[PDB]
RNA sequence: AAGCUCGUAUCAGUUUUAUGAGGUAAAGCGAAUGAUUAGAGGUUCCGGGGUCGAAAUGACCUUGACCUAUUCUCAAACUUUAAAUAUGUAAGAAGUCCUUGUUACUUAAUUGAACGUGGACAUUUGAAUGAAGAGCUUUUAGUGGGCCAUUUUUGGUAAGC
RNA sequence: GAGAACAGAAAUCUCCAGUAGAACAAAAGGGUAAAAGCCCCCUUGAUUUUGAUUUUCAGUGUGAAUACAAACCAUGAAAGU
RNA sequence: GGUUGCGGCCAUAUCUACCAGAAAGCACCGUUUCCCGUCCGAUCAACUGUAGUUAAGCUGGUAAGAGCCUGACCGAGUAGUGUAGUGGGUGACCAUACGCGAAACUCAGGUGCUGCAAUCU
């Protein structure tokens, strides 16, 4: 990804943490009392479970997809790359996120984003998200 | 408003932290007794420190709480020593205040080389009437914000009667 | 197992009538892998009773074949002919319990035409033979009666 | 090696119910038991004296005795291929009256009614219970409600 | 309150609020449990408590029993009933406590039958005694002191009430070591002193000792005793008569009332805010984001 | 094996209805505990650095910790919630209602509690299905190396373990 | 958290917040807030007699435990324990 | 309807901020001879009900408030699960048939009900 499209082209997110410890019966005794010591770690992963997640400019699609393709070879067992309906790491499909943003409703935050809710204190809700409360641009 | 949400002194508590027990301490006791009238209480070390030279439950300090007229007499009398200037700290967020004075002689009280010289901790806890609500046995409740003592109100109160200064920022 | 006993089906290709309520419906549910069942028509209840129908009379299992055999044992409940019997069954009469228990479990032969299907122990719906197959129960039972 | 003490395995059994720790409310003590009352059993972990063993947790029994702070409950426990009679000295905090009969009792009281109400009219009763009958014929109308036709949907991925 | 204080979602979510009557600092359940519960082999037998409570100057006396729907007043006597009897001043005091206790005993014991039989000590030399069971006859009415939150000090007037209910005829099991005039340093009751409190001896001797050592104060408090020409000495005959009057007719006179419930109803509604409707509340939001938002 | 006492009777590796109990699967983690990736905004008379400095309970940068609202990820010995399968009791004559005897227990109390006497109502008498009947007693053999299959499942890389 | 001479990260004094995040000999899990934790006061029921009961179970023993009966006591104003 | 004393269920009663409360009641509040307890009459004890106050307690109302309670074909007949097959697949696993069926989510509605006795414009 970086050599082909630059170190700031994209955002790679390993979406899976190896929390499960693998045991080992290292080696007089035979099978007598054979409870392994820790050997290494591993993520336990599902069907449909996402493993890598990446965000870019649409105009980089291939470069990302070829990256995920090449990483595939690094793994046991079939995985398949999927183009998302969602806007980046957000929870929203590209239109719904556009409708919410080009409304008021959406506000920047470090890497992610915050959304105005109709719930809570009217007061400090008008604080945050000033560019709402007009209902246009 | 105010009618009866006045501003009294709940109590005055003097405190002598001594590094130790024995004579030096029991003398520091005597001071508080001849200065409170009341017979003072003794505090034991809460754990051990060894660079303070103190073993758990050693007796390490004495102190006394004084309430009503007696409290004002002493307050002023040390407030004298402190030339009626305190500091924007001193006054706690909850509205009490305290100050220290070394040399207890600097407020009436003669000398006696068999008693020595001690420094004191003065600490004034303030409240308004109806404090009882928090403190009584039945139907214990809490005082509402428009009654709770504050820093602002106590400094104001202070700056008035006594006619002392607050200093600093 | 237990259920198959309580419905008196303790050997292959034998059959009995069952009045449908929640409390038997569940029983049916419990034994679907092992049975084939459905809604029988007048025609197949008649020919079931006329040909393979036997009474339980101080046990023994006595052929029907004369009407006094029925009046004797079922007469207490109205019911004094082989057709009175059929009539009680099919209309699920007020006295269906007695009428139907009187009937000794029918004993069919294996189907003449065969089973349809190359494997019996899947559900009807999956190309098999077991379960509720509804009105298609008459085609079968006839081929076994 | 193994461990099999009295309250073994009971971590969450005797455990106390979310946000419901503390004093037991006073009605648990104003309740009143007589011999023959049917009671359900459940241990209150907060009351350590007079507590049922875990096997009797979830179990229903009949009262056979009443003492100052307790009731004696008989339970049939089946050990082997046979039941035996067990008598349980329980404190009132671990017992409650069972509802397992309220439908019966309610039904008798009412069965007595519908009967007298019938008898002294002109018979016709029918007061045994009956299972769910299959439903009857019915004519559903279209008027206001023509059938909407669905089909199955294609594969999609949203993610 | 203070910013860095205050509470989280978490905190309030997992909070187990106590019983109301504990949040109110009113009911000590630990003892209520132990006051109320009955021997399980005594079935529906109620466990009547004699509840004594001191307001800022009313004495309350109820005989109460328990019921899982709520408790139950058998009988009730408020020390403000003492004007009916010849007591007008100091009704928060020890002798009022006694009187009111006495009123409660007599009153119920009346409405219970044991009116004639079981009179208790008519004399009152304050000797120590509970009321003994008559020979072949009804056992007396048994009742237990619900001090409530009161501290138990040897002198408390909570036990003043106990004395008059038990001098009145109730069987209220009790010991002597919290009656005024109980010697700390010898298991011994001076009864010449407890007689003194019953009739209000400590109050009158005060009244005396002010009548020549300060009449600034003696007029301030003890005002009303002037206003009705009752100087000390008579304070015993006051209460000694109170006892007579009380015994002579305890049957509780309700107040003549005036104005119906329906009336106290309507006038009190005048000062009662009623809630709002969501439609109404919705209109307070919209209205707010009319103003606070659209650039003033 | 021998039977014995009875028999429409009482009986059930089953359903149904009513009423309990349970903390597994799943789920959860911008809910407690424990773990875990990322930033964003705060807060220091106060963890250390550095510029100004005579210092400052000095100001300005800075990295740490903490706090706030967010974000990716987890648990046999975590958890608010919480299944399916299994599981306790109940579905009447040993039942329901009236009248009012016994006692040394128990009540303030012939109040209660227990046990009763006298009277009112039959098989739609109180769900389903079945019942080559049900209950009971004595005595005695062999056996006390087990192995396999589906599913659940521990140790082991694994095993025809 | 905020406050008070020496006094410092940690001594002793005060106020505010505080669902237990503590303590309850010990392993761990339950349990507990006007307590079951902390301080004080009075004590020996850690006693006497002999049965029933629950767990383990053969429904033997042993250990441990539960609810009563008959005593004598302790404490508490008391209900009680 | 208010308020008190004793309650039952124990958050629709709790929490945060603010405002309002007539009458009675609670309350705060005065005092230190007496019983009683404290380093301290603050707590606790007693005495007055007199000398004062609705400031606090208490009660209620406000809040696109926190929390909590309820509901719904909101999500979802989803996850999971009892049962079947000489079903698919190298396996890992997965469909299908007859059944049972969550939790989160999302949206809406709500924010103490009530027993006994006394009292009150
Ligand atoms: Mg070897
Ligand atoms: Mg090896
Ligand atoms: Mg090992
Ligand atoms: Mg691969
Ligand atoms: Mg005022
Ligand atoms: Mg020193
Ligand atoms: Mg049948
Ligand atoms: Mg043919
Ligand atoms: Mg052929
Ligand atoms: Mg042919
Ligand atoms: Mg074939
Ligand atoms: Mg043929
Ligand atoms: Mg083990
Ligand atoms: Mg609690
Ligand atoms: Mg014990
Ligand atoms: Mg916080
Ligand atoms: Mg939050
Ligand atoms: Mg107590
Ligand atoms: Mg478990
Ligand atoms: Mg799981
Ligand atoms: Mg998972
Ligand atoms: Mg969940
Ligand atoms: Mg977590
Ligand atoms: Mg999310
Ligand atoms: Mg788990
Ligand atoms: Mg079952
Ligand atoms: Mg039959
Ligand atoms: Mg037979
Ligand atoms: Mg044998
Ligand atoms: Mg043998
Ligand atoms: Mg043998
Ligand atoms: Mg062998
Ligand atoms: Mg422990
Ligand atoms: Mg308590
Ligand atoms: Mg011993
Ligand atoms: Mg032996
Ligand atoms: Mg007023
Ligand atoms: Mg004194
Ligand atoms: Mg005072
Ligand atoms: Mg007092
Ligand atoms: Mg106000
Ligand atoms: Mg109050
Ligand atoms: Mg809310
Ligand atoms: Mg399944
Ligand atoms: Mg098979
Ligand atoms: Mg298979
Ligand atoms: Mg699936």
Swiss-Prot record, chain A:
Modified residues (Phosphoserine): 59, 121
Subcellular location, principal: cytoplasm
Protein's cellular compartments: Cytoplasm
One annotated GO molecular function: structural constituent of ribosome
Domain of life, per lineage: Eukaryota
Glycyl lysine isopeptide (Lys-Gly) (interchain with G-Cter in ubiquitin) cross-link, chain position(s): 26
Stretches forming Sequence repeats: 83-97, 116-132
Gene Ontology CC, one term: cytoplasm
GO annotation terms (biological process): cytoplasmic translation; ribosomal large subunit assembly; translation; translational termination
Alphabetical UniProt keywords: Cytoplasm, Isopeptide bond, Phosphoprotein, Repeat, Ribonucleoprotein, Ribosomal protein, Ubl conjugation
2 X 15-17 AA approximate repeats: annotated span: 83-132
Family listed: Belongs to the universal ribosomal protein uL16 family.
Record function comment: Component of the ribosome, a large ribonucleoprotein complex responsible for the synthesis of proteins in the cell. The small ribosomal subunit (SSU) binds messenger RNAs (mRNAs) and translates the encoded message by selecting cognate aminoacyl-transfer RNA (tRNA) molecules. The large subunit (LSU) contains the ribosomal catalytic site termed the peptidyl transferase center (PTC), which catalyzes the formation of peptide bonds, thereby polymerizing the amino acids delivered by tRNAs into a polypeptide chain.
The protein's assembly and partners: Component of the large ribosomal subunit (LSU). Mature yeast ribosomes consist of a small (40S) and a large (60S) subunit. The 40S small subunit contains 1 molecule of ribosomal RNA (18S rRNA) and 33 different proteins (encoded by 57 genes). The large 60S subunit contains 3 rRNA molecules (25S, 5.8S and 5S rRNA) and 46 different proteins (encoded by 81 genes).
Gene it is expressed from: RPL10
From Swiss-Prot, chain B:
The keyword Nucleus is annotated on this UniProt entry: yes
Molecular function as annotated in GO: RNA binding; rRNA binding; structural constituent of ribosome
Subcellular location: Cytoplasm; Nucleus
Single GO biological process annotation from the record: ribosomal large subunit assembly
GO CC annotation: cytosol; cytosolic large ribosomal subunit; nucleus
Keywords: Acetylation, Cytoplasm, Methylation, Nucleus, Ribonucleoprotein, Ribosomal protein, RNA-binding, rRNA-binding
Domain of life from the UniProt record: Eukaryota
N6,N6,N6-trimethyllysine PTM sites in chain numbering: 70
PTM description: N-terminally acetylated by acetyltransferase NatA.
PROSITE patterns noted in UniProt: RIBOSOMAL_L5 (PS00358)
Subunit organization: Component of the large ribosomal subunit (LSU). Mature yeast ribosomes consist of a small (40S) and a large (60S) subunit. The 40S small subunit contains 1 molecule of ribosomal RNA (18S rRNA) and 33 different proteins (encoded by 57 genes). The large 60S subunit contains 3 rRNA molecules (25S, 5.8S and 5S rRNA) and 46 different proteins (encoded by 81 genes). Component of a hexameric 5S RNP precursor complex, composed of 5S RNA, RRS1, RPF2, RPL5, RPL11A/RPL11B and SYO1; this complex acts as a precursor for ribosome assembly.
Family: Belongs to the universal ribosomal protein uL5 family.
Other observations noted: Present with 21200 molecules/cell in log phase SD medium.
Protein name: Large ribosomal subunit protein uL5B
Lineage of the organism: Eukaryota, Fungi, Dikarya, Ascomycota, Saccharomycotina
Curated annotation (Swiss-Prot), chain C:
Keyword annotations: Cytoplasm, Ribonucleoprotein, Ribosomal protein
GO biological process, one term: maturation of LSU-rRNA
Cellular-component GO terms for this entry: cytoplasm; cytosol; cytosolic large ribosomal subunit
Highest taxon in the source lineage: Eukaryota
Subcellular location: Cytoplasm
Record flagged with keyword Nucleotide-binding: no
Main location class: cytoplasm
Single GO MF annotation: RNA binding
Keyword Ribosomal protein listed: yes
Subunit structure as annotated in this protein's UniProt entry: Component of the large ribosomal subunit (LSU). Mature yeast ribosomes consist of a small (40S) and a large (60S) subunit. The 40S small subunit contains 1 molecule of ribosomal RNA (18S rRNA) and 33 different proteins (encoded by 57 genes). The large 60S subunit contains 3 rRNA molecules (25S, 5.8S and 5S rRNA) and 46 different proteins (encoded by 81 genes).
Function comment: Component of the ribosome, a large ribonucleoprotein complex responsible for the synthesis of proteins in the cell. The small ribosomal subunit (SSU) binds messenger RNAs (mRNAs) and translates the encoded message by selecting cognate aminoacyl-transfer RNA (tRNA) molecules. The large subunit (LSU) contains the ribosomal catalytic site termed the peptidyl transferase center (PTC), which catalyzes the formation of peptide bonds, thereby polymerizing the amino acids delivered by tRNAs into a polypeptide chain.
Family that this chain belongs to: Belongs to the universal ribosomal protein uL30 family.
Further details from the record: Present with 101000 molecules/cell in log phase SD medium. There are 2 genes for uL30 in yeast.
Protein name per its UniProtKB record: Large ribosomal subunit protein uL30A
Swiss-Prot record, chain E:
InterPro entries named among the record's database cross-references: Rbsml_uL18_euk, Ribosomal_uL18_C_euk
Entry keyword set: Cytoplasm, Isopeptide bond, Nucleus, Phosphoprotein, Ribonucleoprotein, Ribosomal protein, RNA-binding, rRNA-binding, Ubl conjugation
Covalent link Glycyl lysine isopeptide (Lys-Gly) (interchain with G-Cter in ubiquitin), residues: 163
Gene3D superfamilies xref list: 3.30.420.100
UniProt-recorded Gene Ontology molecular function terms: 5S rRNA binding; structural constituent of ribosome
Its biological purpose: Component of the ribosome, a large ribonucleoprotein complex responsible for the synthesis of proteins in the cell. The small ribosomal subunit (SSU) binds messenger RNAs (mRNAs) and translates the encoded message by selecting cognate aminoacyl-transfer RNA (tRNA) molecules. The large subunit (LSU) contains the ribosomal catalytic site termed the peptidyl transferase center (PTC), which catalyzes the formation of peptide bonds, thereby polymerizing the amino acids delivered by tRNAs into a polypeptide chain.
Name assigned to this protein: Large ribosomal subunit protein uL18
Native source species: Saccharomyces cerevisiae (strain ATCC 204508 / S288c) (Baker's yeast)
Gene that this sequence comes from: RPL5
